[PDB]
Design a protein around this ligand. Structure first.
Ligand SMILES: [Zn+2]
Ligand SMILES: [Zn+2]
Length: 215
């Protein structure tokens, strides 16, 4: 399937993985791991200090993202790259040229896919039994809805994270940034990319609370 969520997520994850040893100036609209993945692009080879190559999973066509050490022309350049490379480099009849994953429907939060977040949180809690930024009033209700006594775990999962290593590392499920639990203890620090589903921390808990009020 072209719009399969799991394939999109794995493309995003691989892009983030091979980009870790490099700093890239993404933008929320034109060029970012999300838009690349939504257009079927996967990492092709290891990126040099100057350019990051990608290959289409159907075409096998190659595109490249430049690197510079910047803010003056990022917008115009990235819009050009989106039109000419992320779309253009596709072969004429490749499905990814004229089609794109519906990110609003499948990736970003909506009332029709909030249940997936509920499932994720419940599954994480079950696998465990097997971060305060909301009012005590609110976290009480959120923890109650998930039948969980550990408020901090509920908050952490509401931030979209999941444990990564035996170490203090924790990884986001939608943008795959890595943060230390020590960082998130008593800090406003937002570890998400600007384009992440969870970048606005209050969005998911707010939708969940509004859902609670309607039951
Ligand atoms: Zn293609
Ligand atoms: Zn994230």
């Amino acid at each position: 399937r072209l719009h399969d969520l799991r394939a999109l997520l794995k493309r995003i994850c691989s892009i983030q993985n091979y980009t870790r040893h490099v700093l890239i100036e993404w933008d929320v609209r034109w060029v970012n791991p999300l838009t690349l993945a939504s257009k079927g692009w996967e990492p092709y080879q290891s990126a040099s200090q100057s350019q990051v190559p990608f290959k289409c999973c159907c075409c096998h066509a190659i595109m490249t993202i430049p690197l510079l050490k910047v803010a003056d022309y990022t917008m115009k350049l990235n819009e050009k790259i989106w039109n000419s490379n992320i779309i253009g480099n596709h072969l004429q009849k490749c499905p990814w040229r004229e089609n794109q994953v519906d990110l609003n429907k499948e990736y970003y939060l909506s009332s029709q896919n909030l249940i997936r977040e509920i499932e994720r949180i419940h599954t994480e809690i079950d696998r465990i039994v097997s971060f305060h930024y909301l009012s005590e009033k609110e976290i009480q209700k959120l923890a109650f809805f998930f039948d969980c006594k550990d408020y901090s775990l509920v908050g952490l999962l509401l931030l979209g994270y999941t444990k990564f290593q035996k170490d203090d590392l924790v990884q986001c499920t939608a943008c795959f940034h890595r943060a230390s639990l020590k960082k998130l203890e008593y800090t406003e620090f937002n570890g998400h990319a600007l384009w992440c589903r969870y970048y606005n921390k209050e969005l998911l808990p707010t939708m969940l609370l509004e859902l609670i009020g309607k039951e």
